[PDB]
């Protein structure tokens, strides 16, 4: 036996789970592959970046990678680093967004 | 709208649905064919003792063993022998006698 | 039964923590006739955990 | 010292093993086996039926 209650309200449909400050990309073998100190995991994907825009509707995942990248670029990189270009997204195997 | 929130779960649900598998190993026991050994423990000063310290680049070189692999074949016949006189109930009791002998070349050439 | 005695450096001793350039064989065990007939037990060096 | 023991019992096992295993009719059959196998041929036709 349980209590029942109505269904609970919608939620964004990922969580950051990491905030990685040292994280290289590579190309081989026609797929980009990511690495880093603070995770063992390697992250494979294809070269394609991913349209987030016109499934993020609600920009929750947006707003958390501009907010998380702006926070960690400000502490350690301001005085000896640069910027490129705009955040890119990208869908590695084993199920994981990573905003780069 | 949750249209998005949808095909969302639908493209990681197809990306970790992916195979992404590995091979299996038999490891048959090693039998002391190659052997290795480990690095030591060891004391060092408690204070700085040596004179003349200087940094460097360093190329260790090893004394070349030059390893030659190669294939061989090896030949012998396994015997064994019993008190079957007795009858295979009793045998048993009396024991067994068994030895491994190795195949004469002429058998090696003109039979097998 | 005791054999002879070995110096540390006649023995290859594996790099630090990454090693290569290392031969090796496929073992294959030849065990004695006696595991069959006797069924003694054949040596399996030191356990492991498992 | 784990080892060491668990090595340890399973000698103590192969001895209980042994001591259950180690039947006195087979000690009889194989002092007997010995006995008519010294006679020869002989001793094989009498030892067949004997047995
Ligand atoms: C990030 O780096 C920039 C320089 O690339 C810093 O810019 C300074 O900002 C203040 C406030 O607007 C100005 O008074 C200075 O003249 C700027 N300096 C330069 C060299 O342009 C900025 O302060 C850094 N941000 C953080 C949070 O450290
Ligand atoms: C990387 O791109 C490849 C295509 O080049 C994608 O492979 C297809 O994936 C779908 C969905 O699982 C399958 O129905 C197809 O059979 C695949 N095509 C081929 C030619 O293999 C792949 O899904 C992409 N992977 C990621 C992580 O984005
Ligand atoms: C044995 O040592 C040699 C170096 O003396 C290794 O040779 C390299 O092998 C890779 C992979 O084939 C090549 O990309 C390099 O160009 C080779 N180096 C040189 C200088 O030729 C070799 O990989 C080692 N073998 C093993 C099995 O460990």
């Not at chain 2, 067994?96 to 058998?107: G, K, L, W």
Request: glycine share 6%.
């Amino acid at each position: 036996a349980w209590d029942w209650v109505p269904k609970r309200p919608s939620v964004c449909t990922m969580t950051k789970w990491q905030e990685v400050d040292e994280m290289l990309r590579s190309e081989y073998g026609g797929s980009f592959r990511f690495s880093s100190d603070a995770i063992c995991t390697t992250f494979t994907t294809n070269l394609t970046e991913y349209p987030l825009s016109r499934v993020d509707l609600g920009d929750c995942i947006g707003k958390d990678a501009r907010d998380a990248m702006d926070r960690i670029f400000a502490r350690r990189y301001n005085a000896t680093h640069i910027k490129v270009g705009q955040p890119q997204y990208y869908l590695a195997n084993g199920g994981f967004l990573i905003a780069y | 709208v949750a249209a998005g929130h949808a095909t969302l779960r639908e493209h990681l649900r197809d990306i970790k649905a992916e195979n992404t598998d590995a091979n299996f190993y038999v490891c048959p026991p090693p039998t002391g064919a190659t052997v290795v050994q480990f690095e030591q423990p060891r004391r060092c000063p408690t204070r700085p003792e040596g004179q003349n310290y200087t940094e460097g680049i360093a190329v260790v070189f090893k004394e070349n063993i030059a390893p030659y692999k190669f294939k061989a074949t090896m030949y012998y016949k396994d015997v064994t022998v019993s008190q079957v006189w007795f009858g295979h109930r009793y045998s048993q009791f009396m024991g067994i006698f068994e030895d491994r002998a190795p195949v004469p070349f002429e058998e090696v050439i003109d039979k097998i | 039964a005791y054999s002879h005695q070995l110096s540390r450096a006649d023995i290859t001793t594996v790099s630090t923590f990454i090693d290569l350039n290392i031969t090796m064989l496929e073992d294959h065990e030849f065990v004695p006739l006696e595991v069959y007939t006797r069924h003694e037990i054949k040596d399996s060096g030191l356990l492991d955990y498992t | 010292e784990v080892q060491r023991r668990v090595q340890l019992h399973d000698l103590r096992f192969a001895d209980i093993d042994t001591v259950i295993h180690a039947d006195a009719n087979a000690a009889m059959f194989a002092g007997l086996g010995a006995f008519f196998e010294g006679m020869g041929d002989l001793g094989r036709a009498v030892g067949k039926v004997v047995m």
